[PDB]
Amino acid sequence: EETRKIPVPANRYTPLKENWMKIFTPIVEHLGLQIRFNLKSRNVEIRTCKETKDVSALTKAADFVKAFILGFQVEDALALIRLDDLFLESFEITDVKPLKGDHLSRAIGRIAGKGGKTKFTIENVTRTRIVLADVKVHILGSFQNIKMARTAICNLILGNPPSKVYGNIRAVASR
Template structure:
């Protein structure tokens, strides 16, 4: 399988002296071959075919602007990568894309940090995409909050939504613990 990486993210995917590449290969039992001219990475599965899918997800996360440390969270079985395309909300207008990126980033990164903190996810805004890493439940809430912002909802409305979802998650966890169904 092949993964395309933007040229300016190839270095982040390989790492200093190839350390990130080696770490991905070691932890996923794969072989990675980088083509620095096209930005394509060939992912060859070793004895674990699931490892190739995990390596692909880690590379996609790095390509979408995440640090390797954050991308390695995808190696856990309960962690997923979700990518939202800003052009679905802004069309091809560079001004509209820039404005929507700014809405999700917020002043001094406050909005992005709030989404990360209240959903326990990592969020990266890169190019025309917004990506999130987290559990399935966390990502669903983060994606909804991001889409609310991209659709023009007020920041205060989105923050209230996030607070409500976090409170509901805590209540559900507490109820599960009391019933003894929490694992």
């Protein structure tokens, strides 16, 4: 038998309990794995049983809850279940430019835009999902769509205006 351990932060405990009934149900009716929510160590234990096949799905089961740990939506997390080749890449904002204080706060603003329109446009065009931490940016999607979204995200934080990135990323969508 094999077992995986998944940490959960204290800020992620509230939506984990609120969206709990739609998390273990795909594990039991379609995946055939037993899970438990260890309150004492604040870990999610996933382990095999006598009812499991398709040993490739164990790693996918670990990547299922890890996506919800980082802040992705539930329906975006089950999108990892039914697809087979999806990867997640993360990087900090200051991994590409030293930004301090007010400049760092405006870097997050240019990624989102008014009402998240700039993020949603990149989300809709590259067919990926982007979530924003305090300084980290996590992108989930197919490998070629990651490099297209990472190129648009980096050009946003260089200071190229969101109008130019909105216009350019729709022309690149024709390939």
